[PDB]
Design a protein around this ligand. Sequence first.
Ligand SMILES: *[C@@](=O)([C]([C][C]1[C][C][C]1)[N]C(=O)[C]1[C]2[C]([C]N1C(=O)[C]([N]C(=O)OC([C])([C])[C])[C]1[C][C][C][C][C]1)C2([C])[C])C([N])=O
Ligand SMILES: [Zn+2]
Ligand SMILES: [Zn+2]
Lengths: 151, 181, 22, 16
Amino acid sequence: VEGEVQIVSTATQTFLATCINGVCWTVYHGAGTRTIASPKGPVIQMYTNVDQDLVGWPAPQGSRSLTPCTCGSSDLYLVTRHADVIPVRRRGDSRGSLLSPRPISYLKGSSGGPLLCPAGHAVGLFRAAVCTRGVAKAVDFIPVENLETTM
Amino acid sequence: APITAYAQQTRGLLGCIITSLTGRDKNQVEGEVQIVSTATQTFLATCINGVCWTVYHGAGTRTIASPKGPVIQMYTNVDQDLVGWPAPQGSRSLTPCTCGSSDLYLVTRHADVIPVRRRGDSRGSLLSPRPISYLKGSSGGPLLCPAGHAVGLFRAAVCTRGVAKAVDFIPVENLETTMRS
Amino acid sequence: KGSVVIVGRIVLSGKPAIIPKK
Amino acid sequence: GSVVIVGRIVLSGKPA
Ligand SMILES: *[C@@](=O)([C]([C][C]1[C][C][C]1)[N]C(=O)[C]1[C]2[C]([C]N1C(=O)[C]([N]C(=O)OC([C])([C])[C])[C]1[C][C][C][C][C]1)C2([C])[C])C([N])=O
Ligand SMILES: [Zn+2]
Ligand SMILES: [Zn+2]
């Protein structure tokens, strides 16, 4: 069994990474320019896009890639580091609103995770939660196109 | 909840043949879609409302191997191109779509779910065309609406130059009509 | 002719899961 | 300091 989502961590914190099209993507604000660990030693990033807050390394072992979305649906689903699925309504190119706001703690550690469409295809990567008084009602995300373009 | 799927091979070539002849399959069943085979070909069979349905052009008039020996088909409709046997003990059934959605998702034998736009009662176009080799073996598989309900069963590919741009399917309506006849 | 034989299955009811480590 | 993989998630729920 291979996973599309890797639960990763630095010395500072924990977050997620998603394998899309042979690349393991995550948030630059979490990984920075760090290398990813492997049994043969540290492997460097293939893509570093500080502006789009995106970094990518070659997909690791035990992983399988996710297919980018091509049906253009607005009914998204955020997957958390706890494997929780959260339906999100796409509000824009890189924004979406949770159908049921959740405490920020619930979305904690999921940046880098995938935003999926009704077919389980990648719509984008969870960039940051947009909260009001500790309640996440929306989320920022990196559209798959950005990834597709960076490659 | 998005549509995700996974496949698991439960039997090999030689075990398949023996089972085909004996008609006695002792393997445990799990799932909504069964990967099925005859000495001739391999395709899919979908369980909807307690009945395991597939394409007549695949199963023909054959029995399905079960733990109690061969099981005769409950429904056969050469015209609707459908056949159905009682769903295997252990399987899980899908339920017909009621939301009338036109955005469907075809589940292939490789457990991939691909988007198709409904262009009529029995047709839908692939948002992303794939070579027909990719769709090979998926006849009898389900076309699901965004909520995961059976809208139809994959029947044939609409291709040219070896690439499928649309799919022809048997709407879940023909199933009820078939059970009624 | 021979019977139709189940040689595999496709499961749609599975939800995202953290792969247990063995 | 490298980013280390501490776990994995399978979207389909595929067991084993
Ligand atoms: C199914 O039984 C297969 C799955 C297809 C997708 C590529 C292989 N279905 C068929 O073989 C059907 C059966 C036979 C002809 N079929 C086709 O899919 C053919 N298309 C077709 O007839 O299209 C129209 C115009 C009627 C919509 C293709 C054509 C290209 C070469 C391959 C066959 C019919 C319709 C009874 C399985 N075993 O996986
Ligand atoms: Zn999609
Ligand atoms: Zn529906």
